[PDB]
Write a protein that binds this ligand. Sequence first.
Ligand SMILES: [Co+2]
Ligand SMILES: [Co+2]
Length: 323
Amino acid sequence: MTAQTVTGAVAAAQLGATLPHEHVIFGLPGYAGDVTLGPFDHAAALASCTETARALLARGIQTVVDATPNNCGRNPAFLREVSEATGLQILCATGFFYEGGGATTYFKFRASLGDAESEIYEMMRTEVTEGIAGTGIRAGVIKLASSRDAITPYEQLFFRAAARVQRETGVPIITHTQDGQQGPQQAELLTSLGADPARIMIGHMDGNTDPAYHRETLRHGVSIAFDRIGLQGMLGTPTDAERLSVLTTLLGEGYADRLLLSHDSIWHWMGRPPAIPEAALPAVKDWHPLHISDDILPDLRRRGITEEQVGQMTVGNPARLFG
Ligand SMILES: [Co+2]
Ligand SMILES: [Co+2]
């Protein structure tokens, strides 16, 4: 095992309770073009993010997996600052985001002129085994993403590169699914390429409310994450009540060792600060990284989920997957 964090290798048994998909900082592609009126205040970001990390530690959370793709404001050196200041363990990612998420097209262009898969493979392999941008800070997971209606031929370059790095290094893979679709397809493709199903987490599976979809995904041996908990009724995301309805069904069916829980929260936004309109405030009220600890786990316990099941989802599963 060992997990590769931004401060170094840590044993699987030292990961503790983990949030496996969050964003310490995050910018939607294009934020860097808005630098003049949306500059990065490093001191303010560090204060805000350290405060958040201290709050998680208070709740028994010892590790966070930052899922931020390379083109979405990823900043390993900043993650390391937050980690060294607080003791919160942080894994960072290597990967690029879905083909309708912007940026792109740099590799789209390179793919049209040459062997982009091989170049993406070398990037992922270098960032996992040696480090990111000269810093010596290594990625502890590979980030993949697909579009809603298909895993596009362009997206597949990244899936094929990631599978090879996975086979060679053991590194975990976590994913983005768009609008509650393609989970079975991701699982099929990655397993078909010989990637280790005990080291794959199919993401945003809470985006779909039909348990048959989750079950099919789960036939492939992989883990699945209800990782946007708290983001409610916003652009097709279900409510947390709908999420927990599906989760308790799956727990009742013995799936606790393959379910994981997160918020997909953003602790500090790159670019201009977010301007949330009045009618959207309910959607984001509970969308912050203390919601699972304070609201969700106690609610599951009230519903009859056992301490053993909660510990499996929040501690056991991450140790196996990331550790
Ligand atoms: Co995502
Ligand atoms: Co995310």
